[PDB]
Amino acid sequence: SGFRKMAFPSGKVEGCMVQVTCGTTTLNGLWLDDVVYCPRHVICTSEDMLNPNYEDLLIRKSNHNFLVQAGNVQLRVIGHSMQNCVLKLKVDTANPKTPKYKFVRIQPGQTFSVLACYNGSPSGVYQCAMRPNFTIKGSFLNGSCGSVGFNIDYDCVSFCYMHHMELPTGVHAGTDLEGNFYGPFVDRQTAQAAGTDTTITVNVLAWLYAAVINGDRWFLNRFTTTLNDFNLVAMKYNYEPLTQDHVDILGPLSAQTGIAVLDMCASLKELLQNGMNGRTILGSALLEDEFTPFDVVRQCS
Amino acid sequence: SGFRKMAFPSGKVEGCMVQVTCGTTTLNGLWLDDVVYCPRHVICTSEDMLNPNYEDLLIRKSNHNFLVQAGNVQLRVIGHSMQNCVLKLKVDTANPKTPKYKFVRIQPGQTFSVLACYNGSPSGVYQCAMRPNFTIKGSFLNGSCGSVGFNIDYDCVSFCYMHHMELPTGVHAGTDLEGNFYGPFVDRQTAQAAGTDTTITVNVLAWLYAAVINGDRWFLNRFTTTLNDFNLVAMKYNYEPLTQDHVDILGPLSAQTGIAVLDMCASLKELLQNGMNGRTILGSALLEDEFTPFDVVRQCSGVT
Ligand SMILES: *[C]([O])C1=NC2=N(C(=O)[C]1)C([C])=[C]S2
Ligand SMILES: [Cl-]
Ligand code: NA
């Protein structure tokens, strides 16, 4: 028993991490089958941060301009193309460690594991969640671009994130594996502020249900609430609006504990009103919002 | 920027996890070279665990009673022996995915990564710190016995932990890879309770340095202190005493940020007495003590 923010075993992703170099810039690439996926701003020079013309920059590139390094072995680039904001380098060798995989674009509130990488070699793994403002609160240093986020269901790795840049507030922005950025961000060094971050309400509720399953009920009350009255209160604490979809998603956890969704919602209204009063829930002094209902039902059986 | 509870890449350990079954009890085993390591209580039934005689149970067993499964391939046991509380099952084939590895024992307050597994299948990885009471606050449901804890220095995997049991307070107890338990525990079904835990002071200090590196500086102040004065405050709040070696270890962080340890202990002393006052540190409303100074340097420098 225990509730820890657990990341997925990174073995299937480590076997796909390579190093991509263009000019003086080195970042990470994802080697799947005979294609290497990496951020397109690897082809940017110092004068190209603010207003890069990626098409103009890419048409001036040949295959041998891209140096792909898998461990100590150099891969031969035989083709290259641009799909939105990711570069796709066709290489002469299929990755024999290519796992069962697919590309999935995720929604805010969804969680995933990140394999932090530098120079194509893995540094560490940690669990993340897509914030409502389409950023992630990860741990990235210079040279971590190309690090990927993923979920592993059975033995299939669902790649959902690729790191591209850090915003001035310390949060991080990236794309899916088709090159489409999460949120309104662009691979430009101009002023782009992330929206005010809010709490993933559906994740807090599932995390409160997990506390009830684990024998913690000190925060429950005998009040209920309407969906609108809860959203009127939750917005005042910068909580994400709770939708009817979120209510149906919490259905199984509600039936397991015997506590209605709007009953748990009134309990959350009181927790925001009172705080924790020196107490903890599942070991935390704050309300955790990076466990999805899917994580809770799976991890708590 | 950013600071996260970061675990080591678990790929080198994933290629060593196998399933070990003795009768109806199945758990995880660590397959290194031609030997599979697993907890010795795999040979116990519900009545055996009440008061087991392991050498009696082992001398009854033979190689065929041990079912080792590596993925989908069965491994043929050709020998069995005991070393303290781990069972060493010699198999006919050496693991081709054996990494460069060492068996090490870690100190309380040091951190390591745990590859949680269920029936030889790795399901999750996370970062622990060995508590001063020699337990770990992990997430181990049934079927996780045999999961290993490890550190990676360069290419060498230092195995330090093997999960054996869960305690009634939700914490977990285990041994090193040589069978030596961590803490005053035994591998049998009896009334066992973890002692009163304390907070690892040197880890809290390293975590405050991580916040300063990350632009969180509101808790700094103009004051400094001495090691004896702070240790008086640490004992009052159930904090591990800060030794002089602990101060030397924090040396590089004190030089990177410019805040002396005793300077930072003055900040920690004020946080213990007056709280945080509605504010957070690295997005936390409590003092985190599961980051060693080496963990902070490694994450804030990009060592791979
Ligand atoms: C690219 O690779 C990059 N990424 C990142 N960064 C840099 O600089 C670069 C930071 C700072 C964070 S993340
Ligand atoms: Cl999603
Ligand atoms: Na100070």
Side-chain angles (χ1 to χ4, degrees):
Chain A
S1 70
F3 219 64
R4 274 208 161 258
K5 218 174 262 144
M6 215 162 51
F8 285 102
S10 60
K12 281 166 207 263
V13 179
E14 296 165 51
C16 313
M17 299 309 302
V18 304
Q19 170 180 279
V20 180
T21 306
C22 176
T24 56
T25 303
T26 293
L27 42 67
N28 310 273
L30 177 73
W31 181 22
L32 295 172
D33 290 311
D34 61 346
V35 186
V36 169
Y37 306 79
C38 84
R40 68 182 179 168
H41 66 71
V42 71
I43 72 174
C44 296
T45 85
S46 278
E47 305 295 324
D48 297 287
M49 298 330 81
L50 298 163
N51 293 294
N53 191 317
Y54 287 104
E55 295 95 338
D56 188 61
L57 291 169
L58 183 63
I59 197 134
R60 310 178 182 264
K61 257 70 209 314
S62 316
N63 294 327
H64 61 271
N65 288 120
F66 299 106
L67 307 206
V68 179
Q69 210 165 306
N72 265 7
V73 175
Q74 282 252 78
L75 300 191
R76 200 177 83 90
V77 176
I78 69 163
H80 67 266
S81 76
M82 173 148 66
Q83 175 176 15
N84 299 293
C85 300
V86 296
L87 195 32
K88 287 199 283 190
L89 309 174
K90 204 110 181 133
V91 295
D92 220 7
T93 296
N95 185 2
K97 297 189 213 165
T98 299
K100 274 199 244 203
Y101 78 101
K102 78 182 91 103
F103 295 161
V104 167
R105 182 177 183 84
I106 56 162
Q107 297 294 126
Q110 181 64 261
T111 61
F112 55 96
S113 296
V114 169
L115 184 61
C117 282
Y118 301 92
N119 301 283
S121 72
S123 179
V125 62
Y126 57 79
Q127 189 79 346
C128 264
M130 173 84 45
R131 304 305 309 175
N133 66 351
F134 297 96
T135 76
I136 71 166
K137 300 182 182 198
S139 178
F140 290 116
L141 298 176
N142 203 293
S144 60
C145 293
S147 286
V148 301
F150 60 99
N151 287 280
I152 304 174
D153 295 279
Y154 299 92
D155 285 310
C156 183
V157 185
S158 51
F159 295 96
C160 55
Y161 179 87
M162 179 169 261
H163 186 52
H164 284 238
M165 57 186 203
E166 181 164 304
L167 291 169
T169 43
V171 301
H172 308 95
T175 68
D176 56 28
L177 272 294
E178 307 200 332
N180 292 302
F181 258 95
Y182 284 105
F185 312 112
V186 292
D187 44 3
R188 277 175 69 199
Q189 282 246 267
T190 48
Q192 37 183 342
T196 37
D197 198 22
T198 55
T199 301
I200 307 156
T201 311
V202 67
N203 281 4
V204 170
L205 288 173
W207 173 80
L208 291 172
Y209 273 118
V212 170
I213 303 165
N214 277 117
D216 221 339
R217 292 172 59 105
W218 71 263
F219 47 81
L220 302 183
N221 65 24
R222 50 192 317 240
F223 287 93
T224 180
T225 180
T226 65
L227 189 47
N228 187 45
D229 281 343
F230 169 78
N231 286 331
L232 282 172
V233 171
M235 248 55 96
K236 288 157 192 182
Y237 300 92
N238 265 335
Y239 263 62
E240 268 293 302
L242 195 81
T243 70
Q244 192 53 57
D245 273 13
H246 292 147
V247 175
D248 310 319
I249 284 168
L250 293 168
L253 285 172
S254 148
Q256 177 180 357
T257 61
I259 303 166
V261 179
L262 296 161
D263 270 14
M264 206 43 111
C265 276
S267 173
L268 175 54
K269 260 158 76 176
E270 190 172 281
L271 271 159
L272 298 165
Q273 162 189 279
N274 302 346
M276 299 267 231
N277 291 141
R279 284 201 272 299
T280 57
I281 303 173
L282 290 163
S284 309
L286 279 190
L287 306 185
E288 184 56 56
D289 75 344
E290 299 212 332
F291 289 103
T292 66
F294 191 102
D295 303 332
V296 171
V297 285
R298 250 47 62 174
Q299 190 33 240
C300 295
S301 182
Chain B
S1 325
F3 207 66
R4 281 269 186 188
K5 190 86 47 83
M6 192 168 307
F8 279 109
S10 58
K12 286 174 159 88
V13 180
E14 289 165 61
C16 305
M17 299 307 285
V18 298
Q19 180 186 300
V20 179
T21 314
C22 190
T24 56
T25 292
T26 165
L27 44 75
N28 318 283
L30 186 62
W31 179 27
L32 297 169
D33 309 294
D34 62 342
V35 177
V36 172
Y37 305 83
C38 80
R40 79 178 171 170
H41 68 68
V42 69
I43 57 191
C44 300
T45 60
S46 282
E47 60 270 15
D48 277 336
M49 278 291 273
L50 254 60
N51 204 297
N53 187 332
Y54 282 99
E55 65 220 319
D56 209 54
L57 294 160
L58 210 29
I59 208 90
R60 298 153 137 200
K61 302 279 179 305
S62 45
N63 301 323
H64 52 84
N65 321 103
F66 292 106
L67 293 186
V68 181
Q69 283 237 265
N72 253 301
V73 163
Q74 75 111 54
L75 302 193
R76 228 169 37 81
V77 190
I78 56 168
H80 60 270
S81 66
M82 215 150 48
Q83 165 172 38
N84 299 313
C85 300
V86 311
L87 182 53
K88 295 166 82 203
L89 300 175
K90 183 174 226 43
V91 289
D92 72 20
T93 36
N95 191 348
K97 295 159 325 283
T98 305
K100 308 334 172 273
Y101 78 94
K102 281 158 28 93
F103 284 173
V104 309
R105 182 160 178 99
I106 49 140
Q107 297 288 87
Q110 305 176 311
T111 54
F112 58 100
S113 300
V114 173
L115 189 63
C117 303
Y118 297 85
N119 296 353
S121 181
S123 94
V125 57
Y126 65 82
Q127 183 76 355
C128 284
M130 167 87 68
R131 305 305 308 171
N133 70 356
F134 298 96
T135 64
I136 62 164
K137 319 193 211 204
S139 173
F140 285 131
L141 305 186
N142 267 101
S144 55
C145 290
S147 292
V148 304
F150 62 98
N151 284 284
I152 311 192
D153 8 333
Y154 299 86
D155 54 347
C156 184
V157 183
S158 289
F159 295 104
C160 47
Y161 183 79
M162 158 148 300
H163 180 241
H164 280 241
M165 66 197 331
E166 169 215 347
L167 302 181
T169 63
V171 295
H172 315 269
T175 72
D176 56 27
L177 269 291
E178 287 191 290
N180 306 295
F181 256 101
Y182 286 108
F185 307 115
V186 300
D187 52 349
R188 77 169 127 102
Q189 282 175 22
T190 43
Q192 300 193 72
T196 56
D197 204 21
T198 52
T199 301
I200 314 156
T201 311
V202 64
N203 289 359
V204 172
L205 284 169
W207 176 77
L208 294 172
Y209 281 106
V212 167
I213 293 168
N214 273 91
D216 227 338
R217 307 176 65 92
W218 65 264
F219 49 82
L220 299 176
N221 62 22
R222 63 175 76 243
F223 310 107
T224 195
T225 194
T226 49
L227 195 52
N228 332 100
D229 297 351
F230 178 70
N231 279 320
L232 293 159
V233 202
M235 182 192 345
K236 190 189 160 229
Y237 296 95
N238 284 27
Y239 263 59
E240 283 298 328
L242 200 66
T243 64
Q244 165 59 224
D245 176 35
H246 285 155
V247 167
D248 306 330
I249 278 143
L250 290 168
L253 286 173
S254 169
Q256 168 180 351
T257 70
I259 290 52
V261 180
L262 278 315
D263 182 0
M264 193 66 92
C265 301
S267 289
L268 185 47
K269 183 182 100 233
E270 293 306 329
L271 294 162
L272 292 183
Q273 290 166 354
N274 317 110
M276 254 162 303
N277 300 134
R279 297 184 289 241
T280 48
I281 297 174
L282 288 171
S284 182
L286 51 85
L287 298 175
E288 290 278 293
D289 81 328
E290 302 214 352
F291 294 92
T292 70
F294 318 90
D295 296 345
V296 171
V297 165
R298 196 150 57 243
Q299 181 169 169
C300 302
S301 92
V303 171
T304 88

